[PDB]
Structure formats: structure tokens, C-alpha cells
Amino acid sequence: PKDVPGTLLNIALLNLGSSDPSLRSAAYNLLCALTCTFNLKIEGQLLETSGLCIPANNTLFIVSISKTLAANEPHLTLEFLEECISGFSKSSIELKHLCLEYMTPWLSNLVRFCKHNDDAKRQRVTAILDKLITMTINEKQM
Amino acid sequence: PKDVPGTLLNIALLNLGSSDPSLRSAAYNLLCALTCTFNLKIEGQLLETSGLCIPANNTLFIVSISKTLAANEPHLTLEFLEECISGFSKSSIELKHLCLEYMTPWLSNLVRFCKHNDDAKRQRVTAILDKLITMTINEKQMYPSIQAKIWGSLGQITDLLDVVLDSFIKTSATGGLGSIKAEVMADTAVALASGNVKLVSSKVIGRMCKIIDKTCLSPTPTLEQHLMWDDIAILARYMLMLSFNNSLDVAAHLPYLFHVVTFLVATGPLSLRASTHGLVINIIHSLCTCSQLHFSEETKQVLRLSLTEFSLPKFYLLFGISKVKSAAVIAFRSSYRDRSFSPGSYERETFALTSLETVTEALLEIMEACMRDIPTCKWLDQWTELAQRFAFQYNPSLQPRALVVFGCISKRVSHGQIKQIIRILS
């Protein structure tokens, strides 16, 4: 589990915007564990709880967390985007609109990895770019 | 033609993103005539021509023109928006996404017309806001984007909250308690309250305290039978949604939030009683994770233990939602945007004033723990004043509950007060 902090972070954010009230609460608890275990620096404070009522409208709250971790936690970028794009194709139309909202703040971090001494990381950004090209071709309504 | 520059401009921009190359060229030329006739100040230069080849991908070009005219041509705002929304409903899905892109910059200009000397212009901005509410209800696939674009920005405009909030309540009132229009407007305010947490909360609480205070004019045997029950039921769903993530600003409103809870514990349909339990859980959770307050490490342990007690089966009984596995499931419904829930099981349990003591004495402990680390706190004095005002006034639906609370949180009593209590018994 300590080798994939970026993979679990996408599962937490994606399911915070769900339409099932129980599914939101468990997603909030998962996000609290990471911020403690991995010492991730977020803006506010979080506390695990049972019985929370989390509103269905959660777009702006999710983006604030995503927009903050991206600014001051760049080393999750490659794991996050590879998983964020993968979850894009497995979700419904309404959730497809959400992933675009909190995905964009991370695209700006690909600069740090574009010329990373050809350490096979440069070979991965080219893989990420290929995924974005596939989405553009298929989704004609958005 | 000189009386409707705003209406012609929307036809130009909307058709500039068509999928037909011939239609795109006609749109470019029409946009050039407007800029010449009306001397509109755009960034670049334009020139009419025949035979231009215009790419189908044109979003960023269209938005730049709209984003500029909005900044330095405000006098088109009321004509443009009225026509932009109207053509929004006549277009296909793909074009609908474009209308949101270049519509957003024009919303900031409504400040200049909100208080325009009641010249019937104030009557139009309220008309426009009604149209936006109608769009939000119908288009459910674009919902995550409308919140972050339309309602997200309007929250940050301080001068416009009062009018925007006012229209929200009226729309919900017509629908009714379980209506769709009321459920959306309750869930939509969360986006609105993000920009100004303090101003939106004080207004929603301000209105809830006054409606209860106005039940004294026409007393009724119970609160539900009153004529203002609907106005108090929908406004409770607004507070439920704003409680999460400390959007009610507990740091300055705690005395009143406890005050409303006591008058609402265990009253109404099972879906409303599950909301009052959830509201308390969210308020306590907000105290623990609030930064404006500096609680000692000892006190935080007191709150965290209380946060667990309220979820025990003992307290599900006090709030009247026994036989319920989880309150969160009952409070919310997945199909709120689709249909309107039909209330059932009109049979409702009776409430005993001995249960109101146990709840009213668990909350008092919570408040006192917080007052130790807050110098010169006035939470308890403010709460006591509200209790007095309702204890010694005739209202068959509220007076019994105010008396039970008044003797529980009061720290002093004089002969005169003890005289009035006996007189009430007489």
C-alpha cells in the first residue's frame, strides 16, 4: 500500500461525488487515512467519523482538495493521472463531467517530468498523452 | 435593428460554432456589421470577406470575443442573457456545452443592475435568475459543470446574495416539501454558500428564527398544523446541507443552532426526523475540525467521545428514529431530481418531555466544555435569552418545550420568575 498513494487518492475523490449516500461517507473516511498515514498537506482538517451526512452536491469541495494537493504534492502526478484517466472510461456520463473538473489542476505538473533525464519517465508522459488523444476522438458530445 | 444589438449578437456567436462551413461564414460577416454599426470595441480587427475557410473547432475564439465585450460593453447584459438562455433550450446537446462557455463572463455584470433604482430593471434580473433555475432542474447530465460555472461564481458576488437567495426560497415554496424544485434548490445552495460562508449562513439562520417567532400570532395545537409548517420544513433542509464542512459557521452561530434543534427534535415525517439527527452530528464534527477556535488537547477528547454517543441505539430512540439502521440513507434519496417523494405512514410516535431533558442536557455539556477554552464567551447567555422569550408567552405548541429547556440551562432565578411559573400552572 505504501507504493501506490496516487492510485488510492483517485478512488477517494471519484467516489466522493457518487450518488449513494453511504458510498460518500466511506469515501470520506478513506481520504482521512491517507492524510495521516502519508502526511499529505491539505488546507483544512479532517476527522474520521461514522454517521456523517454528506451532501450529494460535492463538486467544489472535491476540486479544492485536488487543487491543493497538486500545488504542494507534485510527486503523485504520474500515478494519479494514469489512474484518473483509466477511471474516466469506466464511469457514467455525469461522472465523466466530474473527472474533468479535478483532473485539470494536475496537467500543469507534467513539465517536471518531460525531460527527466530519459529515466523511462519521459516514456510514460508520452503514454499519458496518448490516452488523452483517445478520449477526444470518442466523446463527441463533450 | 438599432434597438436590439443584444439579440443580434447572440445569433452571431451561437452560429459561429455550427457544424456547417457555409453557416459559419455567414456568422463571421454578421459579427463584422455589428462591430461597425454600433462601434463595439473588440480586441482584434475584423474584415468582411467571401470564401473564408473557418475551422469547426472554434470555442476559444468565440469565448475571447464574448469575454471582451462583457468587460467593456456592459449595457448589453440584460438583452444578451435573456436571449442567450432562450436559444439554450432550442439547441442540441453539443451546442449546449458551448453556450455555457461564453455565457459565464456576462453574469458578473448583474451587480450594476441589482439596485438600479427599482426602474423595472430590478424586475428583469429576477426574471433571468428564474430561467437559470429552470435549466438546472432539467439537464441532469451536465449537473456537475453547471454548479462549478454558474452558481459557483455568483456566490462570490457579495452584493447579489440577498436577491439570489430570495428567489431560491420562493421557487421551493411553490413545489412543496417533497417537491423536486425544493430538493434541487436546497442542494444547489451548497455551491452558493462556498463563496461567502458567513453571509449565506447568517441569512438562512436569520430567516428560520423569524418564522418560528411569527407562530405566536395564530397559535395552533401543534407545530405541523400551523400555516407556516412548509416554510419551516424546507428551510430545515437548507440547514442540513450547509452543516457539512462547517458551512454554517458554528463559531458565531452555535447558540441559535442548538435553539432550533430543541424545537424540532422528533417532529414530522420520518425523513425529517432523520435530518435533525444528522444535523447535530455535523455540527459537533464541525467544532472538532474548526481552525478559528483553539481547543486544548483535553477538550478535543471530550467532543470526540460525544460524537460517538449520539450514534448509539440509545439516542436513535430519543430522536424518534428507532427501527432505522442508518439515518443517512433515510435522510437522502437517490432519485430526488427525478420524482417527488410521497409521504407515508402518517402514524407518528408521541414525544415525552422526559426525553427532551436528556437531549437538552447532553448538548449543555458540549457547550460548557467549549466555553472553558474561549475567554469571555457569550454562548450560554444568548441561548438563555431565547428560552425566556418563549417560556413566558402563550403558545400551545412551543411553550411546554421552552419551559423544559429554560430550567435546564438557567444558572439563576428570582422570586418574580418563580411567581410566573406557578401562575402558568394555575
SS3 per residue for B10-30 = HHHHHHCCCCCHHHHHHHHHH
Question: Terminal CA-to-CA distance of chain B, rounded, Å?
Answer: 79
> Per the CB < 8 Å rule, is B328 touching A17?
no
The CA distance from A84 to A73, in Å, is 16
Q: What residues of chain B lie within 8 A of the CB of A141, using their CB? A: 93-94, 97
Q: Among B125, B215, B130, B233, which residue's Cα sits nearest to residue B177?
A: B233
Task: Report the residue of chain A nearest B327, measured CA to CA.
Answer: A51
C-alpha cell at position B230 = 412548509
C-alpha cell at position A72 = 504542494
The CA distance from B340 to B182, in Å, is 10
**Is B214 exposed, middle or buried, given 0-12, 13-18 or 19+ CB atoms closer than 10 A?**
exposed
The pair phi, psi for residue B386, each rounded to 5°, is -65, -40
CA dihedral B87, B90, B95, B99 (to 10 degrees): 30
CB B36, CB B45: distance < 8 Å: no
The CA distance from B273 to B340, in Å, is 18
CB count within 10 Å of CB B32 equals 17
> Per the CB < 8 Å rule, is A53 touching B194?
no
Q: What contacts B104, CB < 8 A, 6 or more positions away?
A: B149, B150, B153
> Per the CB < 8 Å rule, is A57 touching B93?
no
Task: Report the residue of chain A nearest B300, measured CA to CA.
Answer: A47
The CA distance from B390 to B424, in Å, is 13
3-state secondary structure at position B40: coil
The CA distance from A52 to A16, in Å, is 13
- Rounded to the nearest angstrom, the gap between the alpha carbon of residue A139 and the centroid of all alpha carbons in its chain is 20
> Per the CB < 8 Å rule, is A56 touching B187?
yes
Q: What contacts B227, CB < 8 A, 6 or more positions away?
A: B218, B220
Alpha carbon separation from B75 to B5, B81, B112, B187, B202 (Å, rounded) = 10, 11, 10, 33, 33
Q: What residues of chain A lie within 8 A of the CB of B150, using their CB? A: none
User: Which string of b and e fits B286-323 if b means at least 16 CB within 10 Å?
Assistant: bbbebeeeebeeebbebbeebbeebbeeebbebbbbee
The pair phi, psi for residue B132, each rounded to 5°, is -60, -40
The CA distance from B287 to B276, in Å, is 17
> Per the CB < 8 Å rule, is A49 touching B97?
no
The CA distance from A141 to A58, in Å, is 23
Nearest Cα of chain B lies from the Cα of A140 at a distance, in angstroms, of 8
A32 touches chain B (CB under 8 A): no
3-state helix, strand, coil in chain A (%, to 5): 70, 0, 30
The pair phi, psi for residue B185, each rounded to 5°, is -65, -25
What does B196-243 look like in DSSP terms, one character per residue? -HHHHHHHHHHHHHHHHHGGGSS--SSSTTSTTHHHHHHHHHHHHHHH
Alpha carbon separation from A34 to A10, A80, B282, B311 (Å, rounded) = 12, 14, 22, 25
CB count within 10 Å of CB B97 equals 17
A12-20 LR contacts (CB < 8 Å, sep 24+): A13/A62, A13/A65, A13/A66, A13/A102, A14/A87, A14/A91, A14/A95, A14/A98, A14/A99, A16/A54, A16/A58, A16/A61, A16/A62, A17/A58, A17/A59, A17/A62, A17/A95, A17/A98, A17/B144, A18/A95, A19/A56, A19/B334, A20/B334
The CA distance from B391 to A30, in Å, is 46
Helical axes A5-16 vs A77-89, angle rounded to 10°: 40
The pair phi, psi for residue B116, each rounded to 5°, is -85, 55
> Per the CB < 8 Å rule, is A55 touching B190?
yes
Q: Among B288, B418, B280, which residue's Cα sits nearest to residue B360?
A: B280
User: Which string of b and e fits B224-259 if b means at least 16 CB within 10 Å?
Assistant: eebeebebbbbbbbbbbbbbbbbbbbbeebbbbbbb
R_g (Cα) of chain B, nearest Å: 27
CB B36, CB B74: distance < 8 Å: no
CB B334, CB A20: distance < 8 Å: yes
Provide the chain A residues 34-63 that lie in CB contact (below 8 A) with chain B: 44-47, 49-61, 63
C-alpha cell at position B207 = 430567516
The CA distance from A103 to A106, in Å, is 6
**Is B4 exposed, middle or buried, given 0-12, 13-18 or 19+ CB atoms closer than 10 A?**
exposed
R_g (Cα) of chain A, nearest Å: 16
The CA distance from B113 to B399, in Å, is 45
Q: Among B354, B404, B360, which residue's Cα sits nearest to residue B380?
A: B360
The pair phi, psi for residue B384, each rounded to 5°, is -65, -40
The pair phi, psi for residue B47, each rounded to 5°, is -155, 125
**Is B411 exposed, middle or buried, given 0-12, 13-18 or 19+ CB atoms closer than 10 A?**
exposed
Q: Which amino acid is at B372?
A: R
